[PDB]
Design a protein around this ligand. Sequence first.
Ligand SMILES: Nc1ncnc2c1ncn2[C@@H]1O[C@H](COP(=O)(O)OP(=O)(O)O)[C@@H](O)[C@H]1O
Ligand SMILES: Nc1ncnc2c1ncn2[C@@H]1O[C@H](COP(=O)(O)OP(=O)(O)O)[C@@H](O)[C@H]1O
Ligand SMILES: Nc1ncnc2c1ncn2[C@@H]1O[C@H](COP(=O)(O)OP(=O)(O)O)[C@@H](O)[C@H]1O
Ligand SMILES: [Zn+2]
Lengths: 148, 573, 566, 97
Amino acid sequence: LVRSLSPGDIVDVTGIFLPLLTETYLEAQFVRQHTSDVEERVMELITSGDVYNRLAKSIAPEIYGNLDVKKALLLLLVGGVDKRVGDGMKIRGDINVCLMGDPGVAKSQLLKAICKISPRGVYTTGKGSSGVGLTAAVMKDPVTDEMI
Amino acid sequence: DAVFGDRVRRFQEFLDTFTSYRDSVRSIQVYNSNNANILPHRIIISLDDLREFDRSFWSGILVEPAYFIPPAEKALTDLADSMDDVPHPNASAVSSRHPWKLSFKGSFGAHALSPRTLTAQHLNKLVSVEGIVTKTSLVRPKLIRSVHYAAKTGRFHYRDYTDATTTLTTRIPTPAIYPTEDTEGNKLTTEYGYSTFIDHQRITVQEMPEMAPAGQLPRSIDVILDDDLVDKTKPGDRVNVVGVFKSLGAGGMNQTLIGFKTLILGNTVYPLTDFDIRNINKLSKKKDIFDILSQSLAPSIYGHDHIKKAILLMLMGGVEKNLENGSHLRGDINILMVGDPSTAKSQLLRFVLNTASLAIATTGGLTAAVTRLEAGAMVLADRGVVCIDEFDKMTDVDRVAIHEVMEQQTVTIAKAGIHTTLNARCSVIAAANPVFGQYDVNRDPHQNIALPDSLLSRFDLLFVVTDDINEIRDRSISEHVLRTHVTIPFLRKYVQYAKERVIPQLTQEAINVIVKNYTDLRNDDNTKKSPITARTLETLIRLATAHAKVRLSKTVNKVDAKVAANLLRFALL
Amino acid sequence: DNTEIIKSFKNFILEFRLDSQFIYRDQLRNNILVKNYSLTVNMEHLIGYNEDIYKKLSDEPSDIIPLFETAITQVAKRISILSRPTFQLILNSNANQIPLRDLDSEHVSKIVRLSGIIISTSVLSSRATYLSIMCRNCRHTTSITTVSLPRSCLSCGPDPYIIIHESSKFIDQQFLKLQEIPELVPVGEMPRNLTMTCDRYLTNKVIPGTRVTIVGIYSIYNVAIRTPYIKILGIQSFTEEEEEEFLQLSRNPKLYEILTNSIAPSIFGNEDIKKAIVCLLMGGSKKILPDGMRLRGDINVLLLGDPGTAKSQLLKFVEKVSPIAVYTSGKGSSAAGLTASVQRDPMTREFYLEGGAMVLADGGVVCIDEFDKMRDEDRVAIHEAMEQQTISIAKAGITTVLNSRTSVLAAANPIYGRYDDLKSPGDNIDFQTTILSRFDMIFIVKDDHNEERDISIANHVINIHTGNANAMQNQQEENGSEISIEKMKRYITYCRLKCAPRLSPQAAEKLSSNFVTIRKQLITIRQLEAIIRITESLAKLELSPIAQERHVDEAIRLFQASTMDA
Amino acid sequence: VRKDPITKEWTLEGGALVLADKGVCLIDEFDKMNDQDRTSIHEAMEQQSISISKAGIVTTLQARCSIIAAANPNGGRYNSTLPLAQNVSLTEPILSA
Ligand SMILES: Nc1ncnc2c1ncn2[C@@H]1O[C@H](COP(=O)(O)OP(=O)(O)O)[C@@H](O)[C@H]1O
Ligand SMILES: Nc1ncnc2c1ncn2[C@@H]1O[C@H](COP(=O)(O)OP(=O)(O)O)[C@@H](O)[C@H]1O
Ligand SMILES: Nc1ncnc2c1ncn2[C@@H]1O[C@H](COP(=O)(O)OP(=O)(O)O)[C@@H](O)[C@H]1O
Ligand SMILES: [Zn+2]
């Protein structure tokens, strides 16, 4: 089973939980990456047929008069197509949106709503939570001298 | 010993005479039967009931826990395994293994103590400790009973492991390497899946700085958490812990400063008058209630009535609003004061620390930096009010990171590695002085204090106070000082009563005036201390709700909006 | 044989009488009612009852004073019977406290009496007094009351015993550091610091910076390195003719001028500077309002001086006159950064809270030299201490607040070579203007060129270089121009302890008129308190029950000579 | 500071100023050193002694030395039209020594 997992993956791992305080670990047995039970819920919305406006009005139901902005958020949540051009080339299939505005226009509540809705959303303020909070760094392990 | 059985019988008699404990166990068993998640094997016993039934057993537990609690543990475990059939054969041999733990509650009398009031005379006894949790360690399981199996014989033999860190009485040292052969010499098999384990964690409870005496080093106690209550509080939580204050190791008796390692074997965790009510409610019926509580805010300080009114409203606070969508709404009110010195800026700032139920006074570290990450000054401010002096001295990082705390009332850690969200439900009051030595009324506060409008405007009320060179101000401001050459405890009870027992709600009648005034403010083009935005509308709701806290009413009325609008205009004109 | 010793102490406690009360038995009975197991015994009464038991205690206290502790435990047990743990004995003595420089090998293990100031205190630690042990081999159980466990069973192999924790008793221990009084510190000598340990209820009775009297057991424990220490047995912390002498002196009308001239007679001029220093030494008054506002009675003065204006001498003289004074220069303080600190003493391996210079001077005065060249972060603690009289120290997970009710005498060098009258002091003095806003009164000592002043100063230099300055001291004393430095120090402590004046309504309205007229011409409300402190300072010097309007004129003038000087 | 196994307490070893006691201490290029290094020299000439609190050692040593210092003006040339107090970074209190 070696060389199955990779760093940063989201997986469900099945195994045995094995051990005067005892130390515990898990012996991996089966690994998988990330349906009628939810197809019924999906069927209801497409049955109504209200797709763009309903979902664009669904995000932040407590913010006034930002339907055009919410529509851009709705597409950004969905995203485009990450076209693998081939021949070693690559074109991003994601949407980046900037929200300039005066103070008191609720342009930060949308930031909270986007992080809440998205399964992989991260909320950040200030100078990217400083330079150490932004980007990333390699840190040495004092136990094994390894850097992670 | 024979006396051990008699002590067990007393707890059995205790359970018989108080049906509440055993019927609760039966209710738990029925709940477990319906699920055949499983509830843990712990119940809570009131000490007052034990004291009223058997003082000696109650006193015996407090004074000699190692000689009185295990008899109670055996009595409860025996009753649990005998009250019903436990019909399932395979499940009974594993689920019923767990001994039934006990928890204590009630009045502790002389043993109701603190990390400082606790002394060595109370060691080897059961005590209740109240303090603040500073840090915790990783949860790890403790080996309790192992099961051995020989392949050639096909039968099971079990072995127990006990140590003084979890056992109430000092037993003979059990631990050793895991055995490999049985009595017959047959090679044994290690059955990992049939061994019984109990989770264990140690926490460090400390005396709060709120109550610590000045100039003396702190007192702290180590608390052990086991089994089900192994994780009940996070660092910073005000906790009440009951356990056996017990020593460990040796004080150098075998083989100089080394003392006996005194710590508490925690078994229970609880996170933290009528005449006063008859006085708080009674005194609110007069027509001028609000002015009374504004005068009692540092009465020796003359003038500044509106800022005292604003501070009182900040103490009362609004209501944070949550929705089924998962939204959270700001409910705290922030105030900032600006102008020339010698105007009691730090005096009222100091007074707030002397009045609030919880307050933190610091100066411009604010956020959690890096690993457990240390709790910053603004992080420790949850459910409290913050008093920051020299507010101009904030660094660039502090100035850009305070935005989330000011509005969202949340602290977000986004440092390399660990990411988490921490509650920052705090109201912030601060003061600042001009950089150039003197304030210039001909220029806006942004041009004087040098803090950006994007930071200054975040405060709901911005007060600019300057001592005029007029003689009439100088006469009163000096005479009031020279004149020095409803009670405050009642006021603090009023704040305690109002912030908890009454939650006002909105009403369309108040909306009729609040929206109208905000519409006028947006329409009015006259210069003001801040450009009007939607934030003022939220401020009016908070101020009206804060006034409703003073009036002690669940609804909102016209006068609540009238006062809120009038004061807001004062801070703007 | 030892039973007679136990009986003798039993009769001593039960039968000694003072003020018609059995004081030692009564106070032990009161302690039992309070439920604290402590007793205090005065040595001067021990010798009176019987010299034999006193002599035995003084000569071999190693085993006899355990007997006294056990005997009183029996006495307390007997007392409890009539009303139907090991008690502690505390020794107090009034005999002379031999200087710490004088203890020798002949006093080893003997009862000694010392005095000093507590500079540091450590954290508490657990110590054993009663134990129960069990053999791991044959399960033999017994009890034990540097004690060590038996190496062989008393019923099993070497070291068969283990400790039963749930059947044992323990006591609390604290380690402390003490050094000699500054009044006896030799010049060019580091004061003798001393290691002191106390146990049970003697712990946590003092804080660093406290002057105390010590009665204890001087002893030494372990090429042959040895370290002394004291086992603390007890800690303790004006004549009628002198009281009436100063009372008569209070009625002297020329006392203000006489005291002014006595302030550094070797210096020329600067007469009003001398008056300010007297007001600094006298200090104001502190009062507490019911709303939680505490009024600072301390007065702080800054002496902005040009180089060569004897600024070093001005602060140097004050330290020997003020009863509670410490000198600081170049960020140097009492082995700290002018504030409290937590340090680990390797001798006991424990962590100790250590008091800085501003900590030791609680209720006194501190002299700060080279004020313009100190660490800025130290100024912040000073700034809080200068106004709130508190110092805040944070260590790991604990923050502590320490009291510092100290008046500050400060001297500083201007930004340029000399103060320029064309500019505000905030642009002339070489440190933070925020601190400049905190001093009650600042003065600029001047160097105006004058013939007779310079010539008199010039001759004074040759007199020192010729040794005639020693004869000048006799000449000045014969002239009666100075009060004795020891007597003046006694007077400062006398007035600080006996008098606490209050302002009169006439003085208050006079101050109000002065303040209004000053601002009509123009000074902050903060400096109104600074002026008022001077009004209380003058009344305290005269020991008048209340301040008087006649104090206002000098108070206004001295402050006018300070603020309008810049 | 040096360790000593014979007595096990920290021992102190003197620097250049302690060596030149009853002698002369020469400081070439006096201006180029930092103010923290220069602050020690100032208190050396004033008190003729060294005061130090390091590694738990608090003591004073004799530093009776004479000083001869060479320096350079700002910019490497002396400004004849400005005073000495405005030709070097050396502060005036140190010049008075
Ligand atoms: N149209 C709107 N609907 C709902 N809330 C609003 C609206 N406009 C403003 N608000 C309120 O005002 C605040 C806007 O602040 P924020 O989102 O931080 O804007 P900015 O980024 O300009 O500071 C929010 O707390 C929000 O509750
Ligand atoms: N209205 C007032 N009533 C009484 N005292 C006042 C008033 N205004 C200012 N003061 C006095 O002025 C002093 C200035 O304190 P403060 O202005 O808080 O300091 P800072 O200007 O450094 O913040 C205080 O000690 C206070 O006693
Ligand atoms: N009014 C005065 N009375 C007596 N001595 C004076 C007077 N003015 C100056 N002096 C002499 O001038 C010297 C000043 O040196 P000092 O001020 O201590 O140096 P620094 O300014 O570096 O501290 C002293 O030695 C002192 O004897
Ligand atoms: Zn034995």
